[PDB]
Amino acid sequence: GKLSLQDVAELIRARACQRVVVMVGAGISTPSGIPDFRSPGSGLYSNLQQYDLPYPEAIFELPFFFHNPKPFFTLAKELYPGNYKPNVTHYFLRLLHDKGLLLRLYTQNIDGLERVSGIPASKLVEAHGTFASATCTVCQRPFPGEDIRADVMADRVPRCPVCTGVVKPDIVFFGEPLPQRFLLHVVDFPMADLLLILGTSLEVEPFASLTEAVRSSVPRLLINRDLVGPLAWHPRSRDVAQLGDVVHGVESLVELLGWTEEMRDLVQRETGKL
């Protein structure tokens, strides 16, 4: 019938759900202090509306980037790995991994906090790209993302040592193809026996349609402020919605699992490493 969060916890402890696939969005990283620049005001948003931006999405479109890359690099400075720590939400996913329950983590985020939390690259699909590598927009030469950090943190537009063209981190912009590693979804979502969706409004495609790729018998658990996407307008009989604060929803599931003090210990140890 209609499942509960407790019911999901029982399937996880019973290893009836042993191949969990996870989809995450910006909602799991604002608790780390990453400013939600999508939100009007507060505040980078208002400071960054001072450019001649046609629309706010042009910060992630190549035609505008070629015109003026300064808006992008201003925002990159602040999202760049190294200034933020993962939060309980990230460490919950690392704990699933430690317990051998995590089949794959699909992330829309570019803050790199999944890798930092201790999830290995083999278990991760960074569907919208990464700051870990960069590419000259003129000659197409690839670089390690480390090669541009100093320029980025210093408010300088990084330029290519070969042709002096603008070097762009390997973030997927709107209109660009997703990395071919995204094709793992063809195998991962049918192999899933549970789908978790955390902290996203499912407004970016093709990522959002992955919610539909699990088999008919597979529960889909949404932990999110709002009911969104196919869980709103194409619900299935084993869907579960834990609507509210993402951190609160996760911690409630951790409690029903019986993992609260294992989580506390894990978080304390890993954040201390900084």
């Binding site: 999405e57 919208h128 997927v172 912009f173 709107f174 209109g175 660009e176 193809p177 997703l178 407004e203 970016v204 495609e205 093709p206």
Partner: peptide
């Protein structure tokens, strides 16, 4: 060379 989209593509 297209695929990513939001709110209209």
């Amino acid at each position: 060379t297209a695929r990513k989209s939001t709110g209209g593509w």
